[PDB]
Amino acid sequence: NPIRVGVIGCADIAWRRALPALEAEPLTEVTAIASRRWDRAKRFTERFGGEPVEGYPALLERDDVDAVYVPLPAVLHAEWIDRALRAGKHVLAEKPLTTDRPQAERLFAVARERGLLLMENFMFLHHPQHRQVADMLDEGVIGEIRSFAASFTIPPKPQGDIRYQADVGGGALLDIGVYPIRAAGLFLGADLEFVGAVLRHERDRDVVVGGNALLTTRQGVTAQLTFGMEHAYTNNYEFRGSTGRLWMNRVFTPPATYQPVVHIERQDHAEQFVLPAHDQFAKSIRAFAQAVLSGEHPREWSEDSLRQASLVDAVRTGARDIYFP
Numbered sequence: 001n002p003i004r005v006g007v008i009g010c011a012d013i014a015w016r017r018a019l020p021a022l023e024a025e026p027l028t029e030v031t032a033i034a035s036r037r038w039d040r041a042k043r044f045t046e047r048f049g050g051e052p053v054e055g056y057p058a059l060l061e062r063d064d065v066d067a068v069y070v071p072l073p074a075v076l077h078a079e080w081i082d083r084a085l086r087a088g089k090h091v092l093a094e095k096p097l098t099t100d101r102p103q104a105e106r107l108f109a110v111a112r113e114r115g116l117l118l119m120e121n122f123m124f125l126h127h128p129q130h131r132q133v134a135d136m137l138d139e140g141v142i143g144e145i146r147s148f149a150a151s152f153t154i155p156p157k158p159q160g161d162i163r164y165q166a167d168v169g170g171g172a173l174l175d176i177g178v179y180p181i182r183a184a185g186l187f188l189g190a191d192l193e194f195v196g197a198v199l200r201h202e203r204d205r206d207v208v209v210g211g212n213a214l215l216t217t218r219q220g221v222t223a224q225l226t227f228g229m230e231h232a233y234t235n236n237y238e239f240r241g242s243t244g245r246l247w248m249n250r251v252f253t254p255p256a257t258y259q260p261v262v263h264i265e266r267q268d269h270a271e272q273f274v275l276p277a278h279d280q281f282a283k284s285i286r287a288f289a290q291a292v293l294s295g296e297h298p299r300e301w302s303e304d305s306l307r308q309a310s311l312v313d314a315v316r317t318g319a320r321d322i323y324f325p
């Protein structure tokens, strides 16, 4: 039997990425979709199947729901994750899992006491391209790693977007900066420590719209992370090594059909490698479903989500905050 999934929140990321993966995945059946507006739930179920439900509590009461996907605004994640876990449902939560490390530890403790999986949906971690890059780096293609940069920046979203509301979507650090912060943990490891950052806050809407952070490992391998929603589109990372450098674009959100291109440069020679395409959305939802079906809930996933929450908090608290104009 596939796991029966209920979705709370008819989100753009659900319509575009998550629901098409759930629909197509044999291991998951979309049984219910809830919205603050019934008419919106219905539009989603007409597209993806399942019963439309008005409000989120009604969905969590359902006996035909095994697991809930939570694509709510970041600031509202904790309330509804807590409620879903207490309802007995495993939970696939969108990134950032929540807003701070203590909150994250509480949500994991609630899940733990109930034997339930709580997974942070960093779907990009499921794309093979990163392990292919790390394997090249481990092979010595650019020598010892000296530093790392990653960037995820996007042009401004329509007014009224959740990301402009500090107590709903939570701004550019929580919603977008988490990507390059997470790539830095993925590649440089578990001992990253905050050094300095700047966050630009737009006075008018009182929300963070961009930033830059410097982190370091205890050996002095640095990570320069840039993010924002006042920018042209950038979505990349780059390693600087003792004998070369490696970089790639479309790192966090490659299309399912897009073939990554790894660029390497060293003295007097540069190369580009085309890698296979992969559907990271589909892979992330299949990994969640398999963990729920098997009961094998990888320890690394929660430990990594907790370390990630800590670094985000450290950037939020350590940053210099600049309000403009």
Ligand SMILES: NC(=O)c1ccc[n+]([C@@H]2O[C@H](COP(=O)([O-])OP(=O)(O)OC[C@H]3O[C@@H](n4cnc5c(N)ncnc54)[C@H](OP(=O)(O)O)[C@@H]3O)[C@@H](O)[C@H]2O)c1
Binding pocket: 008, 009, 010, 011, 012, 013, 014, 034, 035, 036, 037, 040, 041, 071, 072, 073, 074, 076, 094, 095, 096, 121, 122, 123, 162, 168, 175
């Ligand atoms: N993993 C990824 O790559 C990725 C990509 C994009 C976004 N996301 C994440 O997905 C989550 C949602 O982002 P999104 O871009 O899809 O946003 P979105 O379209 O605003 O969807 C959020 C959904 O939350 C519900 N909601 C409940 N209270 C709300 C409130 N006060 N204001 C607005 N919506 C409220 C709404 O559903 P109802 O109206 O139907 O109740 C809304 O459709 C965030 O945590 C975001 O960071 C992840």
Ligand SMILES: Cc1cn([C@H]2C[C@H](O)[C@@H](COP(=O)(O)OP(=O)(O)Oc3ccccc3)O2)c(=O)[nH]c1=O
Binding pocket: 017, 154, 155, 175, 176, 233, 235, 253
């Ligand atoms: C390709 C592309 C996108 N965007 C805009 C369109 C969009 O507003 C934003 C990101 O598009 P994407 O990287 O596809 O990521 P998701 O929408 O899956 O998830 C996120 C949504 C918001 C923040 C981060 C991820 O960039 C551009 O402006 N130019 C581009 O070439």
Ligand SMILES: [Cl-]
Binding pocket: 121, 122, 123, 124, 125, 252
């Ligand atoms: Cl993702």
Ligand SMILES: [Cl-]
Binding pocket: 249, 261
């Ligand atoms: Cl390219």
Ligand code: NA
Binding pocket: 316, 317, 318, 319, 320, 321
């Ligand atoms: Na600060």
